[PDB]
C-alpha cells in the first residue's frame, strides 16, 4: 500500500511505541483497536495484523471517536530534502511531529508528556479541545470500560477537565491581548482540521464552558451582525426591513455597484433572515387566524389557496431541511421541526376535510374544529423567535426544563382527582346506570375546583335539597357527605400540592438557572449557524429560491458549468495568528505558573 | 351637552388613575415603602416578560375558543371580543363555565352533553390545558422570578433608596 | 485593542481609590461625629465653592452614600436648624 510506504521512519518509531504500548498485558489500546472493526488502511471495510498500529489507522480511530466526518491533513511530503530550503518548513515538521507525539501521549493518557508536546506545538486551543473531547469520549467507550478501568477512566476524566481549563484560559489571554486579533484568529479555518473554523471544533467538543466565554460570544455577535457594524438596535434593523430603499444609503455599513454590494452585504446577514422568518411566521399566524375566524363559504376561498401555496412552500422548506440535514436523527430530535411536522400534517388533514365536500356545513365545522387544534399548534411555533432575546430565552429553556416537575405534579394529583371524582359521582347520583355522563360526573367537576370555581350552588341544585342553608332537609341522609370530601379534596389540592410546586419551582430555578444560560448560549451558536445556513428569501417566495437552487443544482450536475470562488488566507497573516497564539499560549502558561505558586497550600 | 360631559368624565377617569400614581413620590422618605417601591419598579421588567410569555398562549386559546364557541359567523369587533376578553379573566379565578354552557347551546343536565354539534365539546379540553398552563407554569414561575430578583437586588434597592 | 488591560488595571486603581476615602471618613466618624459633620458641610474654595456631598454625587459612587455618617449628615440637613 502506498499510504503506509509514504510514511517516514519517525512514524515507524511512533508505531514501535504503539507496539510497545500494546505489548503490555490487559491493554486498552489493543482492545480499542480490536473493537474498532476497521481496515488496516483506516477505512471501515470491517500482514495487516503486523502493521495494525500504524499512525493513519490511529488517526482514523481518533477521528471516528471525536466527532463525525473529520480527516486531518497529514502532509508527509514536507519531510523531503527538496523542500528543505524553505524558512518555515522546520517549524511545520516540528508541528507535525509534536502533533503525532501529542496524540500518542493523549492515547497513553500521560498528562505531563501531552502538556509538553502541547507546549512545543502550535494551534493549542484546537488541539486541546480535540484532546478534551477525545478524553471525554474515551471514558464512554466500551473497550475502555471494565472492572479495573474505572480509576484510570476517572483520572483520565480529571485530565480531560485539566485540558478543558487551559484552552479557556489561553483564549482569555487572547481576549486580554487583542480582541480584534482574537476575532481574526477564531474565524481562521485550520487546514489540518478539515478546513473548519474552531467554533465548529468547539461545537463538536460540546463543552459549555468554552461557549459561555464572552470573547466567543462577541465573535458570535459579530457573525450575527455580519459585515454591517453593530451600532443598530432591533428597531433600526426592523425599520430597515420595513423601508429598504429609504434606509440603505442612510445606513453605516462595511457608483451603483457599491450600493448593490452594500445591499448584498445587508441581505446576507443571518439576523436579517431572523427578522424575515419571524415576520413571515407572524404573517402566517395572523392570516391563518383570520382564515379560522372567517366563515367558510360553499366554494373554495382565495385565502385558502394562499395558505395552501404558503404551506406547500413550508413543506418544501421542511423537505429542504430534511434533505440537506446533518443526520436524520438530528432532524427528529429538534422539537420545532416536529411541531412543523404536526403543522403540515394537520393542515393536510384540514385541507382534505374541507375539500372532500365543500358544500356540506358539517364537513366545514369538522374542518374548523380540527383547525382549532392547528391554531393552538401554530402559536406554539412562535417560541423559536423568542430565543434571541436576552430575557425570554433562558426562561423558555427553563420552562421546558420545568415541564417535568409539572408532569410529576399531574402524576401526584391524578389519583386524588379520580378518587374524589368517583366518590362525588357516587354520592351526587347513585341508583343510576353507567354511561359517558358517569365519566363526566367523575372527571369534569372536580378538576375545576382546584382553580377557583368550585360549583357549590350547582351541587346544591344537583343535591335535591330545598333548605335555606343549602345542605338541609335533603331526600337522603347519605348525600350530605358531599361537602365533606370536598372539604378534604380542596384542602389537599390547594394547600399541599399547589403549594409544594412553589417549593419545586424555587429549587429547580436555583439549581439550573446557569445551565439555562449556557444552553441558551449554545442555542445561540446553533441559531446563528442555522440562519446563516437558511437562504435569505422569506416563506411566500421560498419556493422561488428553491426553484433557483434546483436550477443551480441541475446546472451543476447535468450541464456542469457552475463554479465558485473561495477566500484564500495569506501565509503571513496565518503566521501572525500563529505567533500571536504562541505569545499568548506562553503568556497564559507563565501567568498560570505565577498564579499556581500564589495560592496558600503550595 | 351631556355627551361632552360624559366624554370629559370618561377621560377624567384616566386622569384620576394617573393622579394617584404620583402619590408614590411621598412614599420614598419612609424606611419601608421606599426600597420596596424601587424594587417594584425594578420588578416591572419581569412582569413585562411574563406578559410577553403568556400573550401567545392567550391569543392562541382565544382564537381556538372563538372558533369553537361560534363558527359559521362573520368577522366583527365581537369576534375580537370573543378572542381576547373571556380567556384573560380565566387565569384570575372567574372562569365563565356556566356562560360557556349558555353559549354552547347544550341542554343536558351535566352541562356538555346532547349538544347541537359534535365538534363543540372540545371547548372544556383546551380550557383544561390553557388554565393548567397559566395557573401552574407561568403563574408559579413568576414566584420563582420574584424570589430570585429580590435576593439579587435588595441591597441595590437600599443604595438607590439612599 | 491594547488599552483593555491598562483600562482594567486602572479600574482596579479606581476601586483602590474608592475604598480608602470611605475608610478615612469611617475614621472621621470614629474620631468625632460633630467635627465630621462640620467637615462635610464645608465648601472647598478650590472645588468651585461646593460641598463634598455634591462632589460625591458627581462621583456617583453608591458605597460612599451608603455610609451611615453621610446618612447622619443627610438627616441633619433634613431636619435643618
Ligand atoms: C391525533 C393527533 C394528530 C392530534 C391532533 C388532534 C386533531 C387532529 C384530532 C384529535 C381528535 C380529533 C377529533 C375526534 C373526534 C371527532 C368527532 C367526529 O365526528 C368528527 C371529527 C372529530 C371532531 C375529530 C377531529 C380531529 C381531531 C380534533
Ligand atoms: C391531573 C389532570 C391534568 C387530569 C387531566 C384532566 C382530564 C383527564 C379531564 C379534565 C376535564 C375533562 C373534560 C371535561 C369535560 C368534557 C366534555 C365532555 O365532552 C366529556 C369530555 C371532556 C372534554 C373532558 C375530557 C377529559 C378532561 C380534559
Ligand atoms: C375518619 C375521617 C373520615 C374523619 C371523620 C369524620 C366523620 C366521622 C364525620 C365528619 C362529618 C360527618 C357527617 C356530618 C353530618 C351528617 C348529617 C347527619 O344527618 C348524618 C351523618 C352525617 C352525614 C355525618 C357522618 C359522619 C361524618 C362524615
Ligand atoms: C392617548 C394618551 C394621552 C393616553 C391618555 C388616555 C386618554 C386621554 C384617552 C385614551 C383613549 C381615549 C378615548 C378613545 C375613544 C373615545 C370615543 C369617542 O367617541 C369619545 C372619546 C373617547 C372616550 C376617548 C377619550 C380620551 C381617551 C380615554
Ligand atoms: C397578556 C395580557 C396582559 C394581555 C392584555 C389584555 C388586553 C389585550 C385585553 C384583555 C381584556 C380586553 C378588554 C376586554 C373587553 C373589552 C370591552 C370591549 O369594548 C372591547 C374592548 C375591551 C376593553 C378589551 C380591550 C383589550 C383587553 C384589555
Ligand atoms: C394529542 C393531544 C391533543 C391530546 C389528545 C386528546 C384527544 C385525542 C382527545 C381528548 C378529549 C377528546 C374528546 C372527548 C370527547 C369527545 C366527544 C365525542 O362525542 C366526540 C369526540 C370528542 C370531542 C373527543 C375528541 C378527542 C379528544 C379531544
Ligand atoms: Ca507553542
Ligand atoms: Ca424547519
Author numbering:
A (entry chain C): 487 to 532, 549 to 756, 787 to 1134
B (entry chain B): 892 to 1053
C (entry chain B): 649 to 729
Quote the study on this structure.
We investigated a TRPM2 chanzyme from choanoflagellates that integrates two seemingly incompatible functions into a single peptide: a channel module activated by ADP-ribose with high open probability and an enzyme module (NUDT9-H domain) consuming ADP-ribose at a remarkably slow rate. Using time-resolved cryogenic-electron microscopy, we captured a complete series of structural snapshots of gating and catalytic cycles, revealing the coupling mechanism between channel gating and enzymatic activity. The slow kinetics of the NUDT9-H enzyme module confers a self-regulatory mechanism: ADPR binding triggers NUDT9-H tetramerization, promoting channel opening, while subsequent hydrolysis reduces local ADPR, inducing channel closure. The structures of srTRPM2 exhibit a characteristic TRPM architecture, from top to bottom, a transmembrane domain (TMD) layer containing the ion-conducting pore, a signal transduction layer consisting of MHR3/4 domain and the C-terminal rib helix, and an ADPR-sensing layer consisting of the N-terminal MHR1/2 domain and the C-terminal NUDT9-H domain.
The tetramerization of the NUDT9-H domain through the buckle helix remodels the interface between the enzymatic module and the channel module. To this end, we generated a truncated construct by removing NUDT9-H, srTRPM2–ΔNUDT9-H. Despite reduced protein expression level at the plasma membrane, the truncation construct still responded to ADPR and Ca2+, generating currents with similar characteristics to the WT. Single-channel analysis of srTRPM2–ΔNUDT9-H revealed channel gating kinetics similar to the WT, albeit with a reduced open rate. In agreement with the functional data, the overall structure of srTRPM2–ΔNUDT9-H closely resembles the channel module of srTRPM2, but with some minor conformational changes that may have contributed to the subtle differences in gating kinetics. Our result indicates that the NUDT9-H domain is dispensable for the channel activation of srTRPM2, which is consistent with the nvTRPM2 chanzyme, but plays a role in the regulation of the channel activity.
